[PDB]
């Protein structure tokens, strides 16, 4: 008859690090009974290695170093099979398993390979803003890697907060999540979060409120990380002595484009930046009492919510500002020094010191004499409730981002803020910086992390775009949020 | 002795659609050997679910039948330990797996639970650019669903075609990858894509060009979907005959200005929206002959290309175009009736609609007496070669698809173009706009899928972005183009 040889793989598919899969090798056309069987791989953009061989019957077995006590190889000469059992496997396992059989055939002189099945092992995943570090906290993976042969990837999808949401809940998305903790009760009201299982050593290493912050329903649902809150930061050497208040704000605009600069850019888009003035002299989201966030009680269209946001609308009336300007624009200007200040939080601070722009950081200004009252974020890292990594995102977590080391990498990349470790926190207080981001986050309130605060996001957002914009009236605008 | 009664689930972990996992129970502090044992499950956002029960011996078994025929119940009592055999599994099966017995503990009246453990099995997902009709593509998925019970995800990742070279390079991405064809050649120099295998009446369905356009080294590497080309969109109310020539342009947005309008904007910051005029008097990418594209030939400093841009950036220095503008800043301004034209490709024409404007699509202008000519892109849906689910996403791509049903459902979200499929685009080819489209598609050039073409994109972007912004001059912004 004919030769009809053929080796055929089955059994790869998709597994998590640390996990196990059993392939299988059915062989035929030739007297497999005889034979050593082998088993390769081959990844993309890497050569060919060989991973495993058996003898005949099965007593005498092999083994490539790279698999060496993780692999066992074995057969079955009633079925013609033969079969690689893969345990502990990790992403630098990720291939296409090939079959092999070698010196058969005609003449005895020819070799065979089956199609292939493909092995695919993800690395740990973590989304993370893109104005973060994103680039430090993969050094930190690059470590974690390194001592685990775990590989680790940082994501920085567009619009991951709203992202995360939808595809935890569709059962997937990445293993780790870092936001704002405001986020987070949202998604520990829907179960995408993972009780998080640090012990009362590793929680005393930071400071009580970051913990409270990530505290839900008593349950706590995320590492803090670290405390963000706006500041004023200006150009010393266009601006040596920056004004105190939003009044002033005007005049040194004019004084200003007298000389072909501005005063004052910023991000207009996002409500986060717009927030601390219309706090200022009143306005609030949620009302706090008795233990619990009143929701029925809604402090967007009172008095001094209004006179905050009239006074930005007259600022861009007046042509001081421009309601398209959004982060990218207000950063350009301010980099390239075409505006005196912007308004922005830690992470920041990195651009502008490749800028060379002699910059300081300060407080906000007051408006009728209020501080302004930004919204202290607690960057904050949840474990998917659908991650099948969670012991390992707990590893990377604990011992590997919440330490000297580790904040510092993500830190020398974009400047986090106050951080949540004590040890690392008392380091970085000397700042000039720091200091002025914690005077005025102690100025402000703490974002609540209740599920509402979603809505609340989205309504903000939208009376502030309108009522700049000339769509909506200031009081249009913050009626349509307060329902 | 105490009640120590404890049961330990293990065994979970990722797995994809129509694999397989071995579940286990270890259970101590009470007599195992006499109780019946169960599995159960609970998914967040869904009640627990029964799943299964064995017997004290083991010969008794009882299933859901949401699983029956699926799972397999086991016990070793040698091991006081009972297993749960899944196998087709599907992305409707994730959740957290229980161990549970009951009537136990003091006075045979307890219930006790293990901590569980998480099982999950992500569903198909395929990535598509955010302009295109990707939640008409999500209908097409839902179908897929209801036929296979497996989920379909598709998302538009921000820059997914910088994306997926680096995550398919990790070892992980989509399933599947839609993008026009210039970019496939990339991918699969790289090893990223599998080889797709159509059988040949498979072929006969789509036009023998567009299969030419995903072929790469001899391979069929994605599935051709329709065929796209930019053309002059025109607002039939503010303009009743569009131009036939450039040269027409700056008067007409004179007198339009003088009515508080414009008469031309489109995307300044893609070089896809700028090529067919730059190419329209002698621009080109990679000369091609004798059956290759000659890499070492690069037409993008020649003077027909400087032609092409020096009136584009004339028309910008004349204030009849902005630097800045980019696509959502054209689409807002055409589809308010701003702007009495734009250019832009069957993708857009849905928002147009839902604009209410009444609109004709034709003809891009001459310059120089020359036909604009446009790049012409075949999107195509391509194979990760890392993806787990191969087979499932052929039927996908084959059988649901590139069927008369699946890109009607696809074309109602957003018009695909001249559709690859050859039933289906004769019953689009009456559409005066797809005709318009077939036009300035023959008037143009297919783009090479060669790996170079990235590289390529990249110098044109950065030679028009800095020639319109004033940072180079023409000829300074395409020498350096040319390197
Ligand atoms: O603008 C509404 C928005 O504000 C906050 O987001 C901040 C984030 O906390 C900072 O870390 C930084 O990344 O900028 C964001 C604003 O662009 C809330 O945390 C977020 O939930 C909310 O949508
Ligand atoms: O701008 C360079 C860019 O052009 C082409 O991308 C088109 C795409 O083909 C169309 O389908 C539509 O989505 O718009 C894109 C331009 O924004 C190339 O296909 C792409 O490789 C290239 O980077
Ligand atoms: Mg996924
Ligand atoms: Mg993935």
């Excluded at 200022?280 to 009302?287: I, L, M, Q, S, T």
Aim: proline share 6%; charged share 25%.
């Amino acid at each position: 008859g004919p030769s009809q040889v053929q080796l055929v793989e089955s059994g790869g598919g998709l597994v998590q690090p640390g996990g196990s899969l059993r392939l299988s090798c059915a062989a035929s056309g030739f007297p497999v009974k005889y034979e050593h069987m082998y088993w390769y791989r081959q990844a993309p953009g890497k050569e060919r290695e060989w991973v495993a061989a058996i003898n005949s019957a099965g007593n005498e077995t092999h083994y490539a170093d790279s698999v060496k006590g993780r692999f066992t190889i074995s057969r079955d000469n009633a079925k013609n099979t033969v079969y690689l059992q893969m345990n502990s496997l990790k992403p630098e396992d990720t291939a296409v398993y090939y079959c092999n059989v070698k010196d058969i055939g005609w003449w005895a002189a020819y070799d065979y390979w089956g199609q292939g099945t493909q092995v695919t092992v993800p690395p740990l995943v973590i989304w993370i803003n893109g104005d973060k570090g994103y680039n430090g906290l993969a050094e930190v993976g690059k470590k974690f890697e390194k001592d685990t042969g775990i590989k680790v990837t940082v994501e920085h999808p567009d619009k991951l907060e709203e992202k995360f949401p939808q595809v935890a809940a569709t059962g997937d998305g990445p293993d780790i999540i870092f936001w704002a903790h405001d986020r987070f009760g949202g998604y520990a009201q829907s179960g995408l979060l993972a009780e998080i299982t640090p012990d009362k050593a590793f929680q005393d290493k930071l400071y009580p409120f970051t913990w409270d912050a990530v505290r839900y329903n008593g349950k706590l649902i995320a590492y803090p990380i670290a405390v963000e809150a706006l500041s004023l930061i200006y150009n010393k050497d266009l601006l040596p002595n920056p004004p105190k208040t939003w009044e002033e704000i005007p005049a040194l605009d004019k004084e200003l484009k007298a000389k072909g600069k501005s005063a004052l850019m910023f991000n207009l888009q996002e409500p986060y930046f717009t927030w601390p003035l219309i706090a200022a002299d009143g306005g609030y989201a949620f009302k706090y009492e008795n233990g619990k966030y009143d929701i029925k009680d809604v402090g967007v269209d009172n008095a001094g919510a209004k006179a905050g946001l009239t006074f930005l609308v007259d600022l861009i009336k007046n042509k001081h500002m421009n309601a398209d300007t959004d982060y990218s624009i207000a950063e350009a200007a301010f980099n390239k020094g075409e505006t005196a200040m912007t308004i922005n939080g830690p992470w920041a601070w990195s651009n502008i010191d490749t800028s060379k722009v002699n910059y300081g950081v300060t407080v906000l200004p007051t408006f009728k004499g209020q501080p302004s009252k930004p919204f202290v974020g607690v960057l904050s890292a949840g474990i998917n409730a659908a991650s099948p990594n969670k012991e390992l995102a707990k590893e990377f977590l604990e011992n590997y981002l919440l330490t000297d080391e580790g904040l510092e990498a993500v830190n020398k990349d974009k400047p986090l803020g106050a951080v949540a470790l004590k040890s690392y926190e008392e380091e970085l207080a000397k700042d000039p910086r720091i200091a002025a981001t914690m005077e005025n986050a102690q100025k402000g309130e703490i974002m609540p992390n209740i599920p509402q605060m979603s809505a609340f996001w989205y309504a903000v957002r939208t009376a502030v775009i309108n009522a700049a914009s000339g769509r909506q009236t200031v009081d249009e605008a913050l009626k349509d949020a307060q329902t």
